[PDB]
Design a protein around this ligand. Structure first.
Ligand SMILES: *[C@@H]1O[C@H](CO[C@@H]2O[C@@H](C)[C@@H](O)[C@@H](O)[C@@H]2O)[C@@H](O[C@@H]2O[C@H](CO)[C@@H](O)[C@H](O)[C@H]2NC(C)=O)[C@H](O)[C@H]1NC(C)=O
Ligand SMILES: [Ca+2]
Ligand SMILES: [Ca+2]
Lengths: 298, 64, 4, 299, 4
């Protein structure tokens, strides 16, 4: 209101005391701000990590000690640069190099020549993503000097049933020969030999024109099939087409597994099929194509 | 006199402590937000310079 | 599949 | 006469509380920092020497990619912009939300820091970029592989955008203090790197030119400012690692001021230490978005 | 900015 001069001194010091008191708290606060900064320097922790061990292929890495399935870098002999891959490693010490995966339909497989050559999709440590490693890489892995390779196809329906198809002496040629697919023989498997063709009973040469051994690779922008039309374009995918196919794991992902002649625009069966195990109008739910040295397979 | 020149000191001591605090407020806002890309979460907040500025003027209205 |  | 004591006492108490609020906030953040933020970035199959090669290989979407400029260095993550100006842009610097601290020493700026990318709302791949500095060594190696153009982009807090394009861009190695060089400008942001702040004159403008400058960090002075006072260092006052002269026309790695507008009394050292680009908004406006991207230059 |  209007205190006395006698009060001015008691008060005058009261302010100086909290003022200094304040400057102190601040000195310590600024300090604490410093300690906080030291805690906010690291980036967010990425769950996905790539393993250190590398080699010519997954089996080579498994031999070097690796034990768990994950992302690794491999560098085949003829490979100019190294590249990332997904290795599946079992308890027996087998290291498969996976080059194809289907499981949800999240990845569009209607890609072009370069895309199928260089690869697309994503690699995950948990092996829960869809992808195509890339023709050139597959060629490089499967044609290392004096190393006979084997291919295993894994299928799963929408009822938890899984089947297999093995092929000995699996090989994929160079771009110069349009990444032609070849193998010595069907190594057996409860999924059946779709690569050998399948009699659809709609013609005499059905079988012959649905076989895949010896077939080059085809994409909409690069036709190399044994049909005057364009399989890859009509079926909208990239694959070793004949006229057209008996086994088609890079086809359109149909939810539920069951689809019809109506589902498609042209009418042709363009799903993820494998005739020797299910009808043309049954697209698988999960798919995986992996390779490993033949000597390693039994 | 004695009491007199004591005030001029606190007026400049506060005028400065204001500018300083106003700055610490900005600094802290910035440093806290820089934790969003490191820690689990960053404290949600907002700055109010208004208060700091109203007082800085409210003060000059006494150094007069 | 096949193109009859 | 007495109202003097009235007022003062009022402020010194209000401040005492402000200190209380702040002390709380800082204490809370310290607790949240006992655990880190996380991400899960599944790696794209396609890879290459850098983003330009990756897009020519079919990678048409902007997201995090793994690149290996050369068989010497181990492959590393980076964010590719595959949409802006025909894509193939490798982001080497990105600011967008003040989530990362840029007032770091020399080693961190050499090694690189920040978050390359974050998960896209419910997705397995990280399709969004975080705030980061690629790393001087890496940036140097990328620019010396062949002619390289640089694209600097920015946006204000209202949504307006401008850009500064440099046809030629190079950054030497550590032994050369990461010396910078740029040329063949064009854009709407203003040629701050070559011509300095257009608001200054003669000598003043000239000391704000970055072209040719060396790189500095608050613990490594290589600026074009000769002094004796250990506190008169560009990096220290404008808080960030950059190619400071005396001091800058552009401070892309400055402090991220929320809102945009800021003043000399908010700055820790009273200098225009924000995400500045004078030639466009002056020295007291901090951009909401700022980034640097490089791509092989095909004449 | 600059430093006169
Ligand atoms: C170069 O800058 C210095 C620093 O002064 C500041 O920046 C100026 C551009 C202007 O914005 C000033 O208001 C800032 O304080 C200028 O310094 C001059 O110094 C002389 C010597 O005391 C003084 O008489 C002048 O008033 C100062 N500048 C002026 C004209 O205000 C210098 O003049 C600037 N040179 C230029 C670009 O003209
Ligand atoms: Ca044909
Ligand atoms: Ca200096």
């Amino acid at each position: 209101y209007e205190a006395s001069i006698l009060t001015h001194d008691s008060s005058i010091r009261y302010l100086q005391e909290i003022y200094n008191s304040n400057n102190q708290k601040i000195v310590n606060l600024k300090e604490k701000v410093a300690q906080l900064a030291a805690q906010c320097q690291e980036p967010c922790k990425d769950t996905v990590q790539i393993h250190d061990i590398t080699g010519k292929d997954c089996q080579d890495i498994a031999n070097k000690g690796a034990k768990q399935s994950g992302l690794y870098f491999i560098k085949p002999l003829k490979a100019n640069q190294q590249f990332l891959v997904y290795c599946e490693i079992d308890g027996s010490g087998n290291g498969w190099t996976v080059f194809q995966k289907r499981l949800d339909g999240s990845v569009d497989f209607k890609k072009n020549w370069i895309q199928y050559k260089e690869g697309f999709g994503h690699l995950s440590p948990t092996g829960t993503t869809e992808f195509w490693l890339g023709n050139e890489k597959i060629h490089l892995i499967s044609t290392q000097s004096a190393i006979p390779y084997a291919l295993r196809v894994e299928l799963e329906d929408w009822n938890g049933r899984t089947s297999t198809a093995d092929y000995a002496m699996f090989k994929v040629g160079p771009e110069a020969d349009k990444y032609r697919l070849t193998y010595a023989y069907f190594a057996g498997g409860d999924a059946g030999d779709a690569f050998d063709g399948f009699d659809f009973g709609d013609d005499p040469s059905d079988k012959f024109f649905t076989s895949h051994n010896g077939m080059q690779f085809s994409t909409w922008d690069n036709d190399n099939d044994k049909f005057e039309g364009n399989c890859a374009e009509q079926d909208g995918s990239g694959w070793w087409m004949n006229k057209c196919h008996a086994g088609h794991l890079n086809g359109v992902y149909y939810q539920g597994g069951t689809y019809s002649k109506a589902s498609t625009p042209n009418g042709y069966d363009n799903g993820i099929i494998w005739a020797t195990w299910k009808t043309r109008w049954y697209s698988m739910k999960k798919t995986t194509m992996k390779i490993i040295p033949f000597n390693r397979l039994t | 006199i004695e009491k007199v020149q004591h005030i001029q000191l606190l007026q400049k001591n506060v005028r400065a402590q204001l500018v300083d605090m106003k700055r610490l407020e900005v600094d802290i806002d910035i440093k806290i937000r820089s934790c969003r890309g490191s820690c689990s979460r960053a404290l949600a907040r907002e700055v109010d310079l208004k208060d700091y500025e109203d007082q800085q003027k409210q003060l000059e209205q006494v150094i007069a | 599949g096949h193109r009859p | 006469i007495p109202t003097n004591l009235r007022v003062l006492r009022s402020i010194l108490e209000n401040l005492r509380s402000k200190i209380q609020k702040l002390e709380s906030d800082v204490s809370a953040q310290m607790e949240y920092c006992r655990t880190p933020c996380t991400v899960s970035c599944n790696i794209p199959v396609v890879s290459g020497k850098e983003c330009e090669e990756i897009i020519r290989k079919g990678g048409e979407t902007s997201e995090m990619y793994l690149i290996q400029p050369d068989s010497s260095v181990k492959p590393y993550r980076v964010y590719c912009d595959m949409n802006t100006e025909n894509g193939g842009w490798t982001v080497i610097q990105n600011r967008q939300d003040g989530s990362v601290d840029f007032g770091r020493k020399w080693d961190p700026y050499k090694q690189g820091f920040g978050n390359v990318a974050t998960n896209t709302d419910g997705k397995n791949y990280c399709g969004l970029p975080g705030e980061y500095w690629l790393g001087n060594d890496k940036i140097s190696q990328l620019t010396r592989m062949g002619p390289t153009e640089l694209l600097i982009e920015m946006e204000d807090w209202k949504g307006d955008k401008v850009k500064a394009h440099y046809g030629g861009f190079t950054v030497q190695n550590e032994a050369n203090k990461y010396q910078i060089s740029v040329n063949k400008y064009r854009g709407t942001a203003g040629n701050a790197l070559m011509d300095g702040a257009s608001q200054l004159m003669g000598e003043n403008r000239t000391m704000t030119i970055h072209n040719g400058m060396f790189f500095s960090t608050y613990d490594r002075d290589n600026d074009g400012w000769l002094t004796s006072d250990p506190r008169k260092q560009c990096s220290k006052e404008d808080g960030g690692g950059w190619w400071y002269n005396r001091c800058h026309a552009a401070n892309p790695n400055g402090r991220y001021y929320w809102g945009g507008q800021y003043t000399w009394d908010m700055a820790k050292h009273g200098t225009d230490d924000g995400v500045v680009w004078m030639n466009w908004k002056g020295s007291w406006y901090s951009m909401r978005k700022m980034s640097m991207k490089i791509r092989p230059f095909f004449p």
